[PDB]
Ligand binder design. Sequence first.
Ligand SMILES: *[C@@H]1O[C@H](CO)[C@@H](O[C@@H]2O[C@H](CO)[C@@H](O)[C@H](O)[C@H]2NC(C)=O)[C@H](O)[C@H]1NC(C)=O
Ligand SMILES: *[C@@H]1O[C@H](CO)[C@@H](O)[C@H](O)[C@H]1NC(C)=O
Lengths: 98, 36
Amino acid sequence: LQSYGFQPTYGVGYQPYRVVVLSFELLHAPATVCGPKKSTNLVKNKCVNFNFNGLTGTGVLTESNKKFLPFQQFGRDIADTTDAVRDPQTLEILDITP
Amino acid sequence: QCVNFTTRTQLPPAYTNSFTRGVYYPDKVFRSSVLH
Ligand SMILES: *[C@@H]1O[C@H](CO)[C@@H](O[C@@H]2O[C@H](CO)[C@@H](O)[C@H](O)[C@H]2NC(C)=O)[C@H](O)[C@H]1NC(C)=O
Ligand SMILES: *[C@@H]1O[C@H](CO)[C@@H](O)[C@H](O)[C@H]1NC(C)=O
């Protein structure tokens, strides 16, 4: 280890620069934290613009029968498109079809 | 507290055939009826 030397007489570049870095990963796992966006009501059997933990989309919502395991949040089709989701407030499983 | 319990007790290591073990979930996404 080598010692930094920081004094106020140092010019730009030699001055200390505080750095904060975020190493977050997204949307291949259940969400846990995000901003102040407010939750709305839940509607079914209607083509709607849903938004579950940052995942926008468009389609009708229907209660599916797929058993999502507790570490699992999203269900995917063959083409890697989302197919079913667990509502973050009610832990029921809902089918999503455009 | 450090205790010197005898020795390594001879040579234990034997070998076995792990047929189809060591399979864990690769990702945290639900899938069904698919050969992923
Ligand atoms: C377990 O064994 C180690 C080493 O075989 C012991 O460490 C020795 O401790 C004595 C003091 O009691 C020292 O004079 C030696 O130099 C140490 N040896 C080494 C290699 O460091 C240890 O004391 C033993 N455990 C107990 C509880 O006595
Ligand atoms: C979510 O939390 C609020 C208050 O924090 C509570 O009123 C509501 O019932 C919770 N959601 C569900 C589905 O219970």
